[PDB]
């Protein structure tokens, strides 16, 4: 489990990491609603800025 | 992720004249005794069950997308490339096709189609339509049922009704110069779309 002239790695995957994977699939969606939210707020907040 | 794995199946170990895959517990049911978990077992679990954290998107160097999109734009002149690409343009006056900015203001399909005809797009439009076939795949029942060719792609500078006047005629796409997409400029990675540029749009290019 050691060979060749390779660098030594430190890949911390010995816990059940497959259980705590966050894939930001929702990246586009959260942008949208982020934008949407600001849009309501501007509305709501009358003429004040944001 | 939990599939194939919803069983308390133990192996029976050796000495029972039968191979050692885990087997369903208990009895009175015929499921019982059957090979479990294994990727080769009916009802098993697949080999290396697919994950969602697989990569799906790809990062291209921003500058290289541009190299491509630029390159791609340049091919939509080169009439032979356009020709090679499908795209009925033996009949069109000259390439790049520039068309009056009046286009952008047309708000009626019929009228828009009319224009497109007039400036030479007729035979390409008719090429879609004559081209609609049933997707050969299983794809045809995953919301991907029909098929057909790409029409002309109409670049404008200002949407004064045009993107809407065209949004219903088969295969015609529209694009604001300021965007311009590599996927539309070279569909399926073949260079040379039939582009009809409004003047307005053509001058903005530069």
């Amino acid at each position: 489990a050691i060979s060749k002239n390779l660098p030594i790695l430190k890949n911390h995957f010995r816990k059940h990491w497959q259980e705590r994977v966050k894939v930001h699939f929702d990246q586009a969606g959260k942008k949208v609603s982020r934008r949407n939210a600001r849009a309501t707020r501007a509305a709501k907040i009358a003429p004040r800025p944001l | 992720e939990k599939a194939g794995h919803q069983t308390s199946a133990e192996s029976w170990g050796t000495g029972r004249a039968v191979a050692r895959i885990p087997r369903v517990g208990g009895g009175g049911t015929g499921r019982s005794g059957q090979g479990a978990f294994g990727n080769m077992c009916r009802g098993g679990r697949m080999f290396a069950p697919t994950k969602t954290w697989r990569k799906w998107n790809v990062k291209v160097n921003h500058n290289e997308k541009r190299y491509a999109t630029a390159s791609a734009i340049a091919a939509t002149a080169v009439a032979s490339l356009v020709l090679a690409r499908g795209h009925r343009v033996e009949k069109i006056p000259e390439i790049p096709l520039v068309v009056s900015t009046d286009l952008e203001s047309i708000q009626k399909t019929k009228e828009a189609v009319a224009a497109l005809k007039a400036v030479g797009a007729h035979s390409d439009l008719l090429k879609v339509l004559k081209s609609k076939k049933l997707r050969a795949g299983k794809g045809k029942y995953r919301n991907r049922r029909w098929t057909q060719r790409r029409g002309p792609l109409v670049v404008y500078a200002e949407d004064n009704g045009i993107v809407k006047a065209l949004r219903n005629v088969p295969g015609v796409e529209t694009a604001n110069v300021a965007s311009l997409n590599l996927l539309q400029l070279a569909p399926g990675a073949h260079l040379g779309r039939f582009v009809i540029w409004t003047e307005a749009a053509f001058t903005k290019l530069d």
Binding site: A46, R48, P49 | -
Partner: protein
């Protein structure tokens, strides 16, 4: 046929109690018949009829009680709104809108001002 409800609701508290008995006599008899005829769906339309009357009877007795409580703490739990168990124990709008003596003074003195940049 089949008795209509909006027709029941004009009959008296007891012109209704009677009609319920008549149906019961009928329905009873109908069942005596049921075991001679090979099929007796007419029976269905009189056991529905009974429901209807009973409904109307219980209906009007509730509207009776419901009113002679209307407007006072304490009316029978089953005329009280249903809502949700939690919804029921929610702070009332009043006891929730409640504002400290020193707070209202502050709210009065400096409230969020409508303002605008640009100019």
């Amino acid at each position: 046929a089949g008795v209509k409800a909006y027709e029941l609701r004009t009959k008296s508290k007891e012109q209704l109690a009677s009609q319920l008995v008549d149906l019961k006599k009928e329905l009873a008899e109908l069942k005596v018949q049921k075991l001679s005829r090979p099929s007796l769906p007419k029976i269905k339309t009189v056991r529905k009829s009974i429901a209807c009357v009973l409904t109307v009877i219980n209906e009007q007795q509730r509207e009776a009680v419901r009113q002679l409580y209307k407007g006072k703490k304490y009316q029978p739990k089953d005329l009280r709104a249903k809502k949700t168990r939690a919804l029921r124990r929610a702070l009332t709008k009043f006891e929730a809108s409640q504002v400290t003596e020193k707070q209202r003074k502050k709210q009065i003195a400096f409230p969020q001002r409508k303002y605008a940049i640009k100019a």
